[PDB]
Amino acid sequence: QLVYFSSSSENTQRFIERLGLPAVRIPLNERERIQVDEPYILIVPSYGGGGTAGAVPRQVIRFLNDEHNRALLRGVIASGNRNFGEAYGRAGDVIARKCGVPWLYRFELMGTQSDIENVRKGVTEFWQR
Amino acid sequence: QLVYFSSSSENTQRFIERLGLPAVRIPLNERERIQVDEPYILIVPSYGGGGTAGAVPRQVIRFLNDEHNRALLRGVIASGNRNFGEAYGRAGDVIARKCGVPWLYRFELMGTQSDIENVRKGVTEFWQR
Amino acid sequence: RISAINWNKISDDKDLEVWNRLTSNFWLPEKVPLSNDIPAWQTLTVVEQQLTMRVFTGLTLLDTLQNVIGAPSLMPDALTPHEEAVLSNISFMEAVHARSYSSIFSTLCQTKDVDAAYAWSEENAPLQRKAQIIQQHYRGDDPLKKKIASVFLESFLFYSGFWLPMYFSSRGKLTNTADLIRLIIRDEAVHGYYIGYKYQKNMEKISLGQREELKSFAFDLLLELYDNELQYTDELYAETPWADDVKAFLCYNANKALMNLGYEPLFPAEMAEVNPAILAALSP
Amino acid sequence: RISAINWNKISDDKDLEVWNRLTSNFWLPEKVPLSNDIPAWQTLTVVEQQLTMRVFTGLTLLDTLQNVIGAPSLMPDALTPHEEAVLSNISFMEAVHARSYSSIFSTLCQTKDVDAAYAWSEENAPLQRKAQIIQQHYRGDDPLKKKIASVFLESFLFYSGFWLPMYFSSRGKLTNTADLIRLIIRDEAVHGYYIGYKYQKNMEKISLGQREELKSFAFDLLLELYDNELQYTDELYAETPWADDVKAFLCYNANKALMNLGYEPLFPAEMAEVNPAILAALSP
Numbered sequence: 001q002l003v004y005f006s007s008s009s010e011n012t013q014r015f016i017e018r019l020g021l022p023a024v025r026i027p028l029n030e031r032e033r034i035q036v037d038e039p040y041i042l043i044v045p046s047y048g049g050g051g052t053a054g055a056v057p058r059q060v061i062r063f064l065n066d067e068h069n070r071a072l073l074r075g076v077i078a079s080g081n082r083n084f085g086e087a088y089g090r091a092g093d094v095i096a097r098k099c100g101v102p103w104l105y106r107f108e109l110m111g112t113q114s115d116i117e118n119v120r121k122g123v124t125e126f127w128q129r
Numbered sequence: 130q131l132v133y134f135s136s137s138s139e140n141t142q143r144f145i146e147r148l149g150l151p152a153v154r155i156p157l158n159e160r161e162r163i164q165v166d167e168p169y170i171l172i173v174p175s176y177g178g179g180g181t182a183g184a185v186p187r188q189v190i191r192f193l194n195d196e197h198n199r200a201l202l203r204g205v206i207a208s209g210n211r212n213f214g215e216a217y218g219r220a221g222d223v224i225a226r227k228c229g230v231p232w233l234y235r236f237e238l239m240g241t242q243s244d245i246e247n248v249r250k251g252v253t254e255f256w257q258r
Numbered sequence: 259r260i261s262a263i264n265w266n267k268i269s270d271d272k273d274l275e276v277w278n279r280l281t282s283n284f285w286l287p288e289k290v291p292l293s294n295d296i297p298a299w300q301t302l303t304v305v306e307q308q309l310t311m312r313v314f315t316g317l318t319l320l321d322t323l324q325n326v327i328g329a330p331s332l333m334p335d336a337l338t339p340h341e342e343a344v345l346s347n348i349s350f351m352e353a354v355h356a357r358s359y360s361s362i363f364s365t366l367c368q369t370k371d372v373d374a375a376y377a378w379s380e381e382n383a384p385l386q387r388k389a390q391i392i393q394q395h396y397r398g399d400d401p402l403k404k405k406i407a408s409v410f411l412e413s414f415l416f417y418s419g420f421w422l423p424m425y426f427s428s429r430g431k432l433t434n435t436a437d438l439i440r441l442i443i444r445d446e447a448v449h450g451y452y453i454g455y456k457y458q459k460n461m462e463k464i465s466l467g468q469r470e471e472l473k474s475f476a477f478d479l480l481l482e483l484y485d486n487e488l489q490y491t492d493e494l495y496a497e498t499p500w501a502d503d504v505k506a507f508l509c510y511n512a513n514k515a516l517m518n519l520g521y522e523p524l525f526p527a528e529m530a531e532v533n534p535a536i537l538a539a540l541s542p
Numbered sequence: 543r544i545s546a547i548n549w550n551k552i553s554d555d556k557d558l559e560v561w562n563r564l565t566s567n568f569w570l571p572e573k574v575p576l577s578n579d580i581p582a583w584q585t586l587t588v589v590e591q592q593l594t595m596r597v598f599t600g601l602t603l604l605d606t607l608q609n610v611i612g613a614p615s616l617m618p619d620a621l622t623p624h625e626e627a628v629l630s631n632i633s634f635m636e637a638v639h640a641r642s643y644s645s646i647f648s649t650l651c652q653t654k655d656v657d658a659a660y661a662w663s664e665e666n667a668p669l670q671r672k673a674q675i676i677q678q679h680y681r682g683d684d685p686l687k688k689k690i691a692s693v694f695l696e697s698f699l700f701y702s703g704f705w706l707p708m709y710f711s712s713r714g715k716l717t718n719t720a721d722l723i724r725l726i727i728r729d730e731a732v733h734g735y736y737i738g739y740k741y742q743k744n745m746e747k748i749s750l751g752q753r754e755e756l757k758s759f760a761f762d763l764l765l766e767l768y769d770n771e772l773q774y775t776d777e778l779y780a781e782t783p784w785a786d787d788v789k790a791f792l793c794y795n796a797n798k799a800l801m802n803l804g805y806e807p808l809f810p811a812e813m814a815e816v817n818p819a820i821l822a823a824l825s826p
């Protein structure tokens with residue numbers, strides 16, 4: 001299955017809506033409960049500030065701090081913008097190196113139809129192996 | 130005798146006019162060069178940061194670079210603003226350090242009536258040495 | 259009338275988020291070692307040099323427009339007092355962008371050729387029409403149309419010019435100029451996001467039928483500006499074989515400008531297939 | 543309508559001088575370690591803490607006024623395209639000044655005490671009267687009067703508030719906050735210089751009759767704001783024995799504000815004799 005986070009701008013939210021696949025959202029509210037029972041691929045936007053870059057949002061950190069949630073993580077897809085250079089999809093590889101999961105795909109904003117097509121085909125082939 | 134520089138804002142110019150003492154101005158035009166014959170006190174505004182990163186205006190540097198003018202320098206008075214902290218009147222102690230002359234006075238903008246009276250008394254007493 | 263701003267009483271968290279991102283990303287063209295590009299500027303052909311100057315004189319005009327009229331016209335329509343402060347940063351940084359183009363000319367180019375490029379930009383029909391269309395929406399009575407025009411200009415239209423330093427970067431030429439342009443691009447990525455976000459927030463307090471009218475207007479304005487930018491690309495890149503590659507880069511950025519406003523991409527993959535070297539220049 | 547800005551074709555050298563000075567002096571409240579003032583803050587009396595918060599809530603209102611209305615109202619009256627770009631920096635930096643006061647509040651103060659100080663500022667007659675007079679001339683149709691009001695506010699009036707951080711600095715208290723205030727003061731010295739210089743350049747194009755009319759207005763406005771500021775000082779510094787030194791510091795800065803506009807100092811030595819420890823805190 002899929003787990004994702006989206007800010008009030010809702011770029012990742014609109015990506016999931018146009019994707020069609022069943023997915024659960026990490027709550028926008030800071031102090032809300034979030035647990036998953038089935039293994040998942042995570043979709044995260046990037047929010048790197050300046051120096052000490054906090055590219056991974058607080059809600060995603062609070063979600064991954066749970067040992068039950070972290071154990072069911074199998075892959076990560078990164079959302080963002082190419083215009084940020086080497087920081088494009090920075091949240092992806094940060095979680096990928098910390099949790100020891102592969103970084104699968106990178107897309108921009110709410111994702112084009114090409115991004116939706118590549119995820120559908122990429123996800124289904126990933127679970128079968 | 131007094132030698133002074135003043136920018137297009139003419140704060141130092143207005144100070145000299147209110148001072149009432151005969152003075153020759155270092156040309157605002159960078160292409161123009163001038164020579165003095167009598168011993169003099171130099172009155173300079175500070176322009177550290179923005180201009181040439183240095184406190185001394187470029188026209189004053191060209192004036193002092195002439196070995197004729199430098200040898201007749203007897204004292205220096207710095208103009209500026211106290212709001213610039215440690216850099217207040219820094220053009221004064223730069224010329225004082227480089228040329229080996231005493232730094233006589235510091236004042237702000239076009240000078241107060243106290244500044245005028247102190248410079249009047251200061252210069253008249255100075256030339257008995 | 260006027261109330262004291264309180265940054266500990268934030269209404270919309272995005273205001274503070276974008277304030278911090280933009281202000282901490284502060285830069286000046288003097289911080290970039292542009293002098294290291296002089297040996298590379300020599301190796302370029304007369305055509306490439308002429309194209310470079312015409313690109314940046316065009317971008318200077320539009321960034322000046324964003325500074326003087328662009329950003330300030332959005333200020334009366336701000337939802338929060340914190341949005342007003344963020345727009346003050348945006349306006350100032352537009353002047354930094356326009357200033358940085360003069361830094362490129364001063365370091366690398368000759369005054370005679372630069373003045374000719376300025377004159378070429380003033381007489382150029384597509385550039386002037388683009389300026390007029392965008393400026394007319396800024397002086398209009400519709401707050402939302404101003405936001406559409408601003409997003410379309412710097413998340414889409416600018417990239418006809420941005421293509422060139424990105425292409426040179428892939429050929430290992432003018433690397434420092436490309437670094438300076440990437441700093442502008444980094445600013446405009448946040449600008450388009452924020453203005454686009456505020457567009458969607460203002461779309462929440464209008465009727466369902468009025469949202470459909472504005473969606474239709476956006477795609478109408480995009481295609482009007484698109485047709486004009488195709489002509490601008492043809493006239494700029496006339497003496498080069500790069501015209502088609504720039505137009506694909508335009509369609510790619512046009513989709514991104516639509517996504518900033520919360521709309522579906524208009525251009526299909528076959529129209530938006532950018533040369534992989536250009537994309538690698540954006541994201542190393 | 544819009545022309546492409548050229549920083550290599552400068553009309554007035556001061557535009558580039560001030561642009562370089564203001565931009566190279568860029569700073570943020572985050573760059574100052576304000577949290578290190580916590581120990582010094584907790585040694586202050588309730589009187590001193592209350593006074594500090596009331597001072598900064600007053601300055602927040604006035605700096606917000608400078609950002610929203612102040613600097614933007616000077617833009618239509620600019621002589622050069624480069625002056626417009628510099629005013630964009632000034633406007634943004636006014637938003638930085640206002641933001642820095644909240645940074646002080648968030649770091650050192652309690653939320654209910656800050657809110658109480660904001661309420662005190664709203665109900666303070668001299669502070670609101672000062673705010674109304676300054677905004678009155680900003681929304682007027684005399685461009686030269688806008689420059690007069692702008693210089694009087696931040697080269698003169700602000701210093702009734704600026705006195706306190708300089709006093710604490712002289713006694714070795716709240717040194718980091720004092721460092722932050724000195725960065726604001728460093729900006730405002732250039733702001734007043736530049737706006738005052740442009741005022742004098744604009745007066746060269748008008749008749750002698752109107753110059754004398756504006757001179758008489760300037761001195762009459764100065765005395766009006768001064769008399770009101772004495773009342774503001776009395777009410778602000780009521781629980782302390784510092785009022786007389788604050789007023790002397792106000793007269794000292796009033797003479798500097800006049801000089802920025804090209805006028806002779808009005809306040810005599812005996813009225814403007816500031817305690818040397820305050821002057822040493824300003825220029826170490």
Ligand SMILES: Cc1cc2nc3c(=O)[nH]c(=O)nc-3n(C[C@H](O)[C@H](O)[C@H](O)COP(=O)(O)O)c2cc1C
Pocket residue numbers: 005006007008009010011012013045046047048049055079080081082084087088089090108109110275276279451
């Ligand atoms: C403050 C800020 C910082 C950002 N940093 C990055 C970044 O470092 N890398 C990147 O690829 N995108 C970055 N972005 C772009 C977002 O990741 C992008 O807009 C994303 O689609 C937002 O998704 P969401 O609306 O679901 O939260 C940043 C955006 C903001 C506002």
Ligand SMILES: Cc1cc2nc3c(=O)[nH]c(=O)nc-3n(C[C@H](O)[C@H](O)[C@H](O)COP(=O)(O)O)c2cc1C
Pocket residue numbers: 134135136137138139140141142174175176177178179180184208209210211213216217218219237238239559560563735
């Ligand atoms: C760009 C710039 C930099 C300045 N730097 C300093 C400085 O470092 N120290 C100082 O005391 N005053 C400084 N000042 C203030 C001037 O020295 C002051 O206004 C002086 O009166 C100008 O004299 P003038 O108008 O005759 O040129 C600076 C002013 C400007 C515009």
Ligand SMILES: [Mn+2]
Pocket residue numbers: 321324351352355412446
């Ligand atoms: Mn720009």
Ligand SMILES: [Mn+2]
Pocket residue numbers: 324348352412445446449
């Ligand atoms: Mn922009």
Ligand SMILES: [Mn+2]
Pocket residue numbers: 605608635636639696730
């Ligand atoms: Mn200010």
Ligand SMILES: [Mn+2]
Pocket residue numbers: 608632636696729730733
């Ligand atoms: Mn100011």
